[PDB]
Amino acid sequence: MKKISRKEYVSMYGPTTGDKVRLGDTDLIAEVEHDYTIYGEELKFGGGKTLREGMSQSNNPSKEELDLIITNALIVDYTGIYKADIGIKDGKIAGIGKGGNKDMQDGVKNNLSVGPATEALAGEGLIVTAGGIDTHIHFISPQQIPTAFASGVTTMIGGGTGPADGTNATTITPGRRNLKWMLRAAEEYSMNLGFLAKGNASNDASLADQIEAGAIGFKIHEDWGTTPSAINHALDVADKYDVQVAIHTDTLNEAGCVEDTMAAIAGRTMHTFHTEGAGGGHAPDIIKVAGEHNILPASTNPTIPFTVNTEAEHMDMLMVCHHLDKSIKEDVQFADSRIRPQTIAAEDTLHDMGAFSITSSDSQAMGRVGEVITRTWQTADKNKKEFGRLKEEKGDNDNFRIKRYLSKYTINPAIAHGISEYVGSVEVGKVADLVLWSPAFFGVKPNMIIKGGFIALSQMGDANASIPTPQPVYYREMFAHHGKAKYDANITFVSQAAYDKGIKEELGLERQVLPVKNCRNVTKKDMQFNNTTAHIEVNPETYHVFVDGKEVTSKPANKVSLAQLFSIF
């Protein structure tokens, strides 16, 4: 029973229990909480390695023989930041533990058995995390998909029909016809998709068809008329059809104020976008909504993290979203009374306190579809700087905080739109949407994006070279991104109603197709870690944001992690 030194061990199998990893260049320190291996029996593939016939690979596999093994993987998920082997079978997470060959290994469950049929993927040294799920996508251009994908985003929930104004302003694919188109278009892409409908309508009839037509929910956007009527109608139908509903509060306050909007929501579940304010909504309050139970708070994107140039930026954007032509009087008045450095500031803090739960993007509409994950982390690193560790933190690490910022674009959005059963976290049973992160580039530049248990895109080099490592090394589409293969590795979400009515056959969808569920039964308390409720106020004058009594405001930054250190642009 010889013994080796961690020094070695780690370079061999990766950080084990008690060890700590630095997320990218941020001051966020992760610590391996647990490890499922059996020191001396760990899986290694290569020349004369372990994963070989009769050895680590059973010649008498279990009738569950894995399709693919990700050896020695450091798992950072809302369920823990531990170590272990991740197994994949039939496009799903078949098992998470030891695994190898029961014929020669002490603790290998038929769940994680390695056989002639299972491929080997090294993971030691890397950090495996579930794919992100940006849920505030404005389907303006099909080019976002790929970009977002390169981020660490496997699922995109939004509304829209291309570079059309209605779409440029709101994430809504209006009507069942336009719905058909996108669902049919979706077939093309490598990235789970779900579309939202126009909640903006006080016509129950017209409101139900879109859901029966594939929509996983509704969206109430200011540009379409976010009135209490619309708001109420949408909400009710949403209940009947067990589907989610997003909202972009009535800024101009024409119909009323948040008081009214909240009164309309009648306590029903509601996923709020750019809650903070800059993204749009009831000026100035709104952000105060993120403190209520029935609300699913979400942060936009640009106003995160808080840097010296943030405020100086937004002034424009409004124009290129609400058709706020840079000239008109009425326009050039509110657009200015919305980008409050106040609300913008507290945000970060609110995100730290668990006041906010999701981190959208708003792709091409006041948000970077490729900067969700990155920012979520910066914003974390930042907060740590200014506030230090957290009270809930245990041990010399930031695990708890990590697991908070992480589930902000993984498990929390998945729940927000009833798809937490299939995706959103590295847990056995769910769809194998995983991404391997090389510690140094965590939160910004992922190694590979495996979709539905099979590589869809990864960092690839000189296709002509003698090895995959040599430059140019950018992201290149992978097999599960082509042919019929794509069809097998992706899921286009829709509603039960549609699912049952056979929307799949109806529209000849070849893509996998599942229905969204459990969307009306959830509340703020259903948000992992970020489940904090707390009556907040906002001074109409100073605009200062108060919570429970105390005042919350982060300090603007002059530099951020995960930036210029990694991209030539």
Binding site: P228, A263, A266, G267, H293, N521
Partner: protein, 238 residues
């Protein structure tokens, strides 16, 4: 003699009894079954002869077997013996309670719980409230029932009780005799705090704003303690 399956059931039981009696007779400590039967079988005949009453047999059965008659454990086992027999007035349920006693030290499946106390509803800041039954009939409210919506007779501050349940053992309840006045203990409802049903007062999320409505409706519906309508501003949904 049209024999009902019910009758056969008994004819069988009866002899199950005869064996029983016939065994101890020969001097043998009766076991679980044997006791049970015997006891039961007795009542059946007693009801037949039409002499003793239900009330009586219910008691007299406790005098059929001495703690030295049965085996060690039997006593503890037979918590009670239920048996319906046909009395001249009709079939009746003679329930014989604890017919024998712990004349032994053995007790099958006995419980060795570890002394100490369990704290119900951990950290849940309770609150007392005056509650008087101004109605002619009694009222038992339960553990997880939205107190605020209790019978429109329990006069008290509904307002102070919005979204709360009698801080007591999960399951049990509190009784109010017409007239009786007390101060119940009631913690906030946990979970997502989604009140739906009961008296139709909330049917939403326990909100300080949803509250306004509940308080308003209870006023119109007549629940004592439901404050008053100080120029109520109606909402777009309620």
């Amino acid at each position: 003699m049209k024999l009902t399956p019910k009758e056969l059931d008994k004819l069988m039981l009866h002899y199950a009894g005869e064996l029983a009696k016939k065994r101890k007779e020969k001097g043998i400590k009766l076991n679980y079954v044997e006791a049970v039967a015997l006891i039961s079988a007795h009542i059946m005949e007693e009801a037949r002869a039409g002499k003793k009453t239900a009330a009586e047999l219910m008691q007299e059965g406790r005098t059929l077997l001495k703690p030295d008659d049965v085996m060690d454990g039997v006593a503890s086992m037979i918590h009670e013996v239920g048996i319906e027999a046909m009395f001249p007035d009709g079939t009746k349920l003679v329930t014989v309670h604890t017919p024998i006693e712990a004349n032994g030290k053995l007790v099958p499946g006995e419980l060795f719980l570890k002394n100490e106390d369990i704290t119900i509803n951990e950290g849940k800041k309770a609150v007392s409230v005056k509650v008087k039954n101004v109605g002619d009939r009694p009222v038992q409210i339960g553990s997880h029932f939205h107190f605020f919506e209790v019978n429109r007779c329990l006069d008290f501050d509904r307002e102070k009780t919005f979204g709360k349940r009698l801080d007591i053992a999960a399951g049990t309840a509190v009784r109010f005799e017409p007239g009786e006045e007390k101060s119940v203990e009631l913690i906030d409802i946990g979970g997502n705090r989604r009140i739906f049903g009961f008296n139709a007062l909330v049917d939403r999320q326990a909100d300080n704003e949803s509250k306004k409505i509940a308080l308003h409706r209870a006023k119109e519906r007549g629940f004592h303690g439901a404050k008053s309508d100080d120029n109520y501003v109606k909402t777009i949904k309620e």
